[PDB]
Amino acid sequence: RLQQWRKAALVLNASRRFRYTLDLK
């Protein structure tokens, strides 16, 4: 199923480093 398929590699990868860049503030 598309669920957790294309997103599991989108938000878990692309944004995988969003917590650091966001906390850097």
- Output the CA–CA distances (angstroms, integers) from residue 1 to 5, 12, 14, 17, 21, in the order listed: 7, 17, 20, 25, 31
Measured between alpha carbons, how far is 16 from 9 in angstroms, rounded to an integer?
Answer: 9
Question: Radius of gyration of the chain from Cα atoms?
Answer: 11
Q: How many domains does the chain have?
A: 1
* Structural determination approach: NMR
Give the structural domain span for 24.
1-25
Residue in the block written with tokens 């199923």: 1
